[PDB]
């Protein structure tokens, strides 16, 4: 489950 | 059926920013602070007069309480950038009007500026 | 008008008095102003005493008669051996005389109960100098009289109570070694005598105001009296049932029981060891019983303050914490004793859910010893698995942000309740965590509190169990983020994900696809204009770095370069959006990673790309401020340049040694730059005067040579290669700031310069000897003159004067060897100047420079220099020292002043002084230095104290010089000698106490 | 509803300089000694109505002690002031309190920590611990920075008028209201002024 954690956090983002 | 068991509202705020206030002891050649706290532009919605309030953080206790007269002049202080200097014929701040030479400073120099063109911003409403 | 009474030529008008302290007390204004300052100087007249015969008896006001009484207090304390006899005799009798009445008197006994105990302390003091050797016979008198009256029963306990405090509780200070222990043992003769009075009241009841009485005073005797008076006795019963019981008597209770938990008791017999467990199963059940039991909401009751419900409360959490820190183990293996120690836990529990910082620092503290101890002793932690799971989900819940020292208290214990269970720590975060999620809990104090639990935490689980729960947590964590709405929202929870990430370096090592993801999340987030977001995101940065800066100056497996390089290759990019600060801690992180490369051509060809943006805007300003120095005039510009220097310091202070090729490229320009800011800021004031040091323009040219200063300042201290800081770095650093410094006026010196000397000194001072001699001459005699007028001006002057005066006294002393006579004169002025200074950087310093200077004397042997010091000097060093000694002004200083004097006499009961300390005129010839240092000493004392008897000065000198090799006691004859000049008549044997 | 505070503590702690500022808003930089006591009216305005403290600001310095313990007779409640800087200020801080506690049996009190923001601070915050005994309030405050400068008032004002849930609230603001032969004095007092610098200029306000 650490390739989906990677990119899970790569698209956080501040704004909607 | 079951039975279940501060006077600034009339006015808008036009401007509001953190500083610091200052008052002139003349017979001590000393600068005093009155206050830290937000400084805000009330207009009153049944006058327009813009005003100046200022309270002291965490007490709440008013340091200015004065008109925007349109004769007042905002004038650097020598050892800053982030200053006005204003003398205040009538402030209400601790009973009667009494006169005050104050000084308020802020931030950084963009809040110093701007504060300046809110404050001749609302000599322009108080004039009408 | 109210300065009648002043006249002590006429009698004192009592009704005059009367009205001029009603102003004082009930009035206001002017009016209370300056009929404060008449009871001044009538209170501090030295006759006063003699008129408050009068006013104690003849005035209607209670004031007057306390003011009076305090008016004696101050002739018994300070000149009660000075006066004739029969005025002894006259006061004692009289107050005895009093408090006889306003016993008697009930209305008077319930009505002025300040008065009253006025005069129970006056007695007190009279009772310190006349007892028992003047007055045998005052403790059983004063057990007769308690039985016939029970107001004056009670008052006599009030009597005893005072008197334990005065001689066993606040002695130390107050009165000599020798009265203190005299008093002592009068106490412990006759105990025997006042616990039975105590005891006998305490079991036959029955007034309430008679118990408390005695119960307070029961308190302070247990501050020293043997444990045989509580434990074979039946005292602790009386106090563990009977007085917990009742309210009135319940808080004096709780605290005589928590002062007994602390007795000085056998840890071998087996019958107090049942006493001790008794006391506590009878607190705790009437606790239960009459109070609240252990189900109750301590915190809703806490926050209620009904009464004395959280003085109640924080006395139960002293009591519990003290009894069962010392006592637990006596529960802990009887199986009867198991339901107790779990309540007595219980009550602890619910005592730390109370919203009350200081009161849960108290829990805490006692959690700390109870789970530190489960974790290293056998066999105990399988009793406490259900206080510790409520424990860990108290601590969570109330963690604070990373007071720190609070913070670290509480990580402490956290870290030992996972050693004790990980498996129950983890299902409470996770369910937290999820009613977070669902929003039962959901706040931005919730959600941070939470994140700071979990990365508390950090490094206590096993590699494997931590992957997943990080991997858990931040996957719900990027999930509450995504649900929430909002930028103020999703900046809270963003902000939580990297502080967790942050604090689990072991887990982001291993990963470094996670840990590059993360990096250029941070990067991103140095573009958001929310505020708060880019400072979080730079000291994210950073403390990554920290930890895990190995894994950015290698070649990761997966790609063609080290990290560190991609970082430097978009820094412009990655920071433009940020404040300089920001910037400045960007760029030390970036060092940081470069330190770790050990190759030295590849660290410094990326100290040198790090450094290729300021070292650009540097050259450019360096060539078009040269060509001419008009644009240093421009604020802009002298932005620019600060900003250059801060970064070099920046990158400089996580680079230290290996920051010094950076150095060279900059360093003999920099200096010159150093020389312009120099002469344009002395040229403003010279154009505009002292008020241009406060303009915006000088104070940011100023701003340009501090941080020069402490640039330099920065890699001297962390410097390698010292031969380099001497032969390349010295030299041309002394001569941009040394004469600079020494022709401004005293307004543009800046102190740094003296704080960066004294850098230069203390690393490499050893190798520069008339670097040093040079340093003096330029800031020695001119900075003296700033400060030797008065104690206020210039403080940061002051505290880096003395700090240079000290380091050249340690590392090249020889340069004060080379002063002129009129110089070292100076110097030793200056010493004595620091000496009486309040402020305490400069009078640690003053006193550590004057010992440290006796040593470099000394270790010179016999020789002309050694000789005339002494002769010049010796007695001035005594003379000053004795004298913040005994002014009360320099208290702070005392174990140095000691520490000084004790060096100084030594020398002279050593025979290391060789010279004669006197002129062979005025003392006949062949006489020891011992014997005109104490002629000396005595004299200097008889003059300076004149109060004193010849006898006592003597014994004081005697005493004082035989114990010159022994700190301890040297400093008890001292604190005698500052307790005997504080009053008349001290007792000159007491100097023999050691 | 006034209520008499007696102020304790060692010279220099900043006793006058803490009243001061809540009196006027200054920051007094110089220490000039009180001389026995000095007394100031100090209200303060709540959701219960206003609240007056009569502050008798009492004298550290032994030789200006004037009445002493005299001052604290029928007194309300209380501050110990020590300074943080200043260890033998907190050593003295139980010889404050038993001669406050001998004449004021059953008063609360409140142990202040004043000048935390000097970085240099000398008593550690795990070294204070003699308020828990005594059931005092405790508080890190800075008359300086103005940290926590309100709760030790806040404390007390609960303590006095019984009541958990008091708080501070604005008090209102009337309206403020609105010659030739002053225009060359108000002038003459602001060019001084003026060329008078602002002190503390590298703080953050
Ligand atoms: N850095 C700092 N200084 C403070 C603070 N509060 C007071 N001071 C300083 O401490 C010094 C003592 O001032 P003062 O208020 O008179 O102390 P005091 O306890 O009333 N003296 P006394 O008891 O003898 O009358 C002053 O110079 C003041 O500027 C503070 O919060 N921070
Ligand atoms: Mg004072």
Redesign the interface.
């Given at each position: 489950?650490?390739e989906?954690?990677?990119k899970?956090?790569?698209e956080?983002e501040?704004?909607? | 059926h079951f039975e279940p068991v501060t006077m600034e509202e009339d006015e808008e705020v036009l401007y509001k920013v953190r500083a610091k206030l200052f008052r002139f002891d003349a017979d001590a050649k000393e600068w005093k602070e009155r206050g830290t706290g937000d400084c805000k532009f009330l207009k009153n919605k049944k006058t327009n007069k813009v005003r100046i309030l200022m309270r002291r953080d965490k007490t709440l206790k008013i340091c200015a309480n004065h008109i925007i007269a349109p004769e007042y002049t905002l004038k650097p202080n020598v050892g800053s950038d982030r200053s006005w200097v204003y003398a205040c014929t009538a402030d209400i701040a601790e009973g009667e009007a009494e006169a005050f030479t104050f000084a308020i400073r802020f931030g950084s120099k963009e809040n110093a500026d701007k504060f300046k063109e809110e404050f001749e911003k609302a000599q322009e409403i108080n004039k009408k | 008008s109210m300065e009648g009474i002043l006249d002590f030529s006429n009698d004192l008008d009592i009704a005059l008095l009367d009205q001029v302290v009603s102003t004082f007390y009930q009035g206001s204004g002017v009016q209370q102003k300056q009929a404060q300052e008449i009871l001044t100087k009538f209170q501090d007249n030295p006759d006063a005493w003699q008129k408050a015969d009068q006013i104690l008896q003849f005035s209607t006001n209670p004031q007057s008669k306390f003011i009076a009484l305090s008016i004696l207090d101050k002739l018994i304390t300070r000149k009660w051996k000075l006066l004739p006899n029969d005025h002894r005799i006259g006061i004692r009798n009289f107050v005895v005389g009093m408090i006889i009445s306003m016993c008697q008197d009930d209305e008077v006994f319930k009505t002025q109960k300040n008065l009253i105990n006025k005069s129970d302390l006056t007695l007190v003091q009279i009772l310190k100098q006349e007892w028992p050797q003047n007055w045998p016979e005052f403790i059983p008198e004063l057990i007769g009289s308690s039985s016939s009256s029970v107001n004056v029963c009670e008052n006599n306990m009030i009597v005893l109570k005072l008197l334990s405090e005065e001689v066993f509780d606040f002695s130390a200070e107050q009165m000599t070694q020798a009265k203190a222990l005299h008093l002592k043992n009068s106490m412990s003769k006759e105990f025997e005598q006042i616990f039975k009075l105590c005891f006998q009241v305490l079991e036959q009841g029955s007034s309430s105001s008679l118990i408390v009485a005695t119960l307070e005073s029961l308190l302070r005797y247990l501050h020293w009296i043997p444990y045989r008076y509580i434990y074979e006795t039946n005292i602790l019963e009386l106090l563990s049932t009977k007085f917990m019981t009742s309210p009135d008597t319940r808080a004096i209770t709780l605290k005589c029981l928590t002062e007994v938990s602390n007795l000085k008791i056998p840890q071998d017999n087996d019958l107090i060891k049942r006493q001790t467990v008794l006391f506590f199963q009878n607190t705790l059940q009437q606790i239960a019983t009459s109070v609240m039991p252990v189900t109750a909401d301590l915190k809703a009751t806490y926050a209620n303050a009904n009464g004395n419900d959280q003085s109640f409360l924080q006395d139960l959490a002293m009591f519990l914490t003290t009894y069962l820190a010392r006592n637990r183990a006596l529960l802990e293996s009887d199986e009867s004793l198991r339901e107790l120690l779990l309540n007595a836990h219980q009550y602890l529990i619910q005592l730390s859910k109370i919203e009350e910082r200081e009161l849960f620092k108290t829990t805490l503290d006692y959690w700390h010893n109870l789970v530190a101890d489960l974790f290293y002793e056998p066999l105990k932690k399988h009793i406490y698995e259900e206080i510790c799971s409520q424990l860990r989900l108290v601590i969570i819940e109330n963690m604070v942000r990373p007071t720190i020292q609070l913070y670290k208290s509480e990580r402490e214990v956290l870290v030992y309740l996972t050693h004790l269970n990980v498996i129950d720590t983890e299902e409470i975060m996770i369910s937290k965590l999820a009613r977070q999620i669902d929003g039962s809990e959901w706040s931005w104090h919730n959600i941070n509190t939470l994140s700071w639990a979990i990365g508390s935490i950090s490094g206590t689980m096993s590699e494997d169990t931590e992957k997943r729960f990080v991997v858990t947590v931040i996957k719900d964590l990027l999930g509450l983020c995504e649900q929430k709405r909002g930028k103020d929202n999703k900046a809270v929870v963003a902000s939580d994900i990297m502080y967790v990430v942050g604090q689990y370096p072991r887990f982001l090592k291993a990963h470094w696809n996670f840990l590059r993801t993360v990096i250029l999340k941070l990067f991103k987030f140095m573009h958001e204009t929310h505020e708060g977001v880019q400072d979080m995101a730079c000291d994210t940065f950073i403390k990554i770095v920290q930890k895990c800066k190995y894994h950015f100056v290698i070649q990761q497996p997966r790609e063609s370069e080290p990290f560190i390089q991609t970082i430097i290759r978009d820094i412009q990019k990655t920071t433009a959006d940020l404040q300089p600060q920001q910037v400045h801690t960007f760029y030390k992180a970036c060092g940081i990673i470069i330190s770790e490369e050990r190759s030295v051509a590849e660290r410094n060809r990326l100290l040198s790309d790090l450094m290729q943006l300021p070292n650009m805007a540097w050259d450019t300003i360096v060539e078009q401020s040269t060509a001419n120095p008009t644009l240093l005039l421009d604020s802009e510009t002298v932005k620019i340049i600060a900003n250059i220097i801060k970064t070099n310091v920046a990158v400089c202070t996580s680079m230290g040694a290996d920051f010094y090729p950076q150095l060279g490229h900059i360093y003999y320009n920099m200096l010159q730059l150093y020389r312009a800011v120099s002469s344009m800021i002395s040229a403003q004031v010279a154009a505009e005067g002292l008020i241009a040091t406060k303009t915006p323009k000088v104070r940011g040219l100023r701003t340009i040579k501090k941080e020069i200063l402490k640039l330099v300042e920065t890699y001297i201290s962390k410097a390698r290669n010292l031969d380099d800081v001497v032969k390349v770095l010295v030299e041309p650093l002394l001569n941009a700031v040394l004469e600079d410094y020494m022709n401004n006026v005293p307004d543009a010196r800046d102190a740094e310069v003296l704080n960066c000397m004294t850098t230069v000194v203390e690393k490499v001072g050893h190798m520069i000897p008339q670097g040093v001699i040079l340093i003096l001459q330029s800031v020695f005699e001119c900075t003296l003159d700033m400060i030797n007028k008065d104690f206020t001006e210039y403080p940061e002057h002051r505290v880096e004067f003395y700090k240079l005066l000290k380091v050249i006294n340690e590392k090249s002393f020889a340069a004060f060897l080379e002063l002129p006579p009129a110089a070292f004169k100076l110097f030793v002025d200056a010493i004595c100047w620091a000496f009486k200074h309040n402020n305490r950087d400069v009078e640690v310093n003053g006193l550590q420079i004057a010992l440290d200077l006796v040593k470099n004397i000394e270790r010179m042997g016999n020789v002309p220099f050694a000789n005339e010091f002494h002769k010049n000097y010796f007695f001035i060093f005594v003379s000053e020292t004795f004298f913040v000694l005994t002014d009360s002004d320099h208290k702070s200083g005392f174990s140095k002043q000691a520490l000084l004097l004790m060096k100084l006499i030594s020398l002279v009961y050593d025979n290391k002084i060789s010279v004669p300390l006197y002129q062979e005129a005025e003392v006949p010839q062949g006489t020891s230095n011992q014997v005109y240092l104490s002629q000396y000493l005595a004299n200097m004392l008889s003059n300076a104290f004149p109060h004193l008897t010849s006898e006592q000065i003597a014994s004081f000198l005697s005493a004082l010089t035989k114990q010159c090799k022994d700190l301890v006691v040297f400093k008890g004859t001292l604190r005698d000698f500052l307790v005997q000049i504080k009053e008349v008549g001290g007792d000159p044997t007491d100097y023999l106490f050691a | 509803v006034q209520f008499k505070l007696v102020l304790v503590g060692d010279g220099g702690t900043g006793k006058t300089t803490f009243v001061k500022r809540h009196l006027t808003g200054e920051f007094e930089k110089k220490y000039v000694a009180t001389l026995g006591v000095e007394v100031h009216p100090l209200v303060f305005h709540t959701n219960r109505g206003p609240i007056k403290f009569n502050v008798w600001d009492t004298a550290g310095q032994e030789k200006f002690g004037g009445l002493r313990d005299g001052y604290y007779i029928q007194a309300q409640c209380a501050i110990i002031m020590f300074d943080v800087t200043s260890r033998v200020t907190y050593k003295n801080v139980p010889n404050w309190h038993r001669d406050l506690v001998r004449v004021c049996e059953n008063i609360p009190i409140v142990l202040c920590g004043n000048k935390v923001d000097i970085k240099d601070r000398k008593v550690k915050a795990k070294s204070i611990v003699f308020h828990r005994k005594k059931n005092l309030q405790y508080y890190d405050i800075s008359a300086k920075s103005n940290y926590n400068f309100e709760k030790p008032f806040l404390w007390l004002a609960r303590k006095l008028i019984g009541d958990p849930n008091l708080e501070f609230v604005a008090m209102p603001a009337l309206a403020p209201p609105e010659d030739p032969a002053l225009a060359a004095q108000y002038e003459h007092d602001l060019e001084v002024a003026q060329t008078t610098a602002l002190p503390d200029e590298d703080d953050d306000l």
């Open positions: 489950a650490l989906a954690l990677q899970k956090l790569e956080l501040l704004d909607e | - | - | -």
